């Protein structure tokens, strides 16, 4: 029942929410495991960059962010061809390549 004055609230606890609860007590262990895997892969690929393949310059696709510049999924075939890089050799020498991206500009 409403008290004197306050906000109308709609708590979404009308289901059996107590059976599906995600506690985060394994967060530090997860961070430690991810780190260990990261360094293990970095050691595995001996001289190669730890981050991975280089990626391209892209513009965010929205009025809210079109002023910013991201890191894209991969270089497209038009760019590879005009840069003189074969689409199959780029991946094995360290260039991320995707064929979906176009080039309007």
């Amino acid at each position: 029942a409403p008290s004197r004055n306050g906000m109308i609230l709609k708590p979404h606890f009308h289901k059996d929410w107590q059976r599906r609860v995600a506690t985060w007590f394994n967060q530090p262990a997860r961070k430690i495991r991810r780190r260990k895997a990261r360094q293990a892969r970095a050691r595995r690929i001996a001289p190669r960059p730890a981050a991975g393949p280089i990626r391209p310059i892209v513009r965010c696709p929205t009025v809210r962010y079109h002023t910013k510049v991201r890191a894209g999924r991969g270089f497209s075939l038009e760019e590879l061809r005009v840069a003189g890089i074969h689409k199959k050799v780029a991946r094995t020498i360290g260039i991320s390549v995707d064929p979906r991206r176009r080039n309007k500009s």
């Binding site: 029942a1 409403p2 004197r4 004055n5 929205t62 009025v63 809210r64 962010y65 002023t67």
Partner: protein, 147 residues
């Protein structure tokens, strides 16, 4: 902490601060927001007018990004650039005016609220207001639109 709570001081009083005539029963008035129009009508009308009913048009696939348009005011307009910029423009004698781009700092529309210091400015933005335009013109300066 349980040490400081009212329950500790309430031990020994049969009632537990809930009365003898009207007990502490489960849900005397109904659960949640029940009876908003029937037996809590007075409270709803007194403290949340306009709760019941419909108004306006429905827009199905709303995308906030289309309507994203942060605003800035003229009193804050000079804070976008460094102080050294403003003082250099102030004691400059060639009449050159510094360029302030609010889109670079993350603003899209310039609204004219505050007083503007008397020195020429080249304000470039995406949207302007009539009063902001007239303030800039009166102080001496230029308004530039960008897309």
């Amino acid at each position: 902490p349980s040490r400081l709570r009212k329950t500790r001081k309430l031990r020994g009083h049969v009632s537990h601060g809930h009365g003898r005539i009207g007990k502490h029963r489960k849900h005397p008035g109904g659960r949640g927001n029940a009876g908003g129009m029937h037996h809590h009508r007075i409270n709803f009308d007194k403290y949340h007018p306009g709760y019941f009913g419909k108004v306006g048009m429905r827009h199905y696939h709303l995308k906030r990004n289309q309507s994203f348009c942060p605003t800035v005011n003229l009193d804050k307009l000079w804070t976008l650039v460094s102080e050294q910029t403003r003082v250099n423009a102030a004691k400059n004698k060639t009449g050159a005016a510094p360029i302030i781009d609010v889109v670079r700092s993350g603003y899209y529309k310039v609204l004219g609220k505050g007083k503007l210091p008397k020195q020429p400015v080249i304000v470039k933005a995406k949207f302007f207001s009539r009063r902001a335009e007239e303030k800039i013109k009166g102080v001496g300066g230029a308004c530039v639109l960008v897309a």
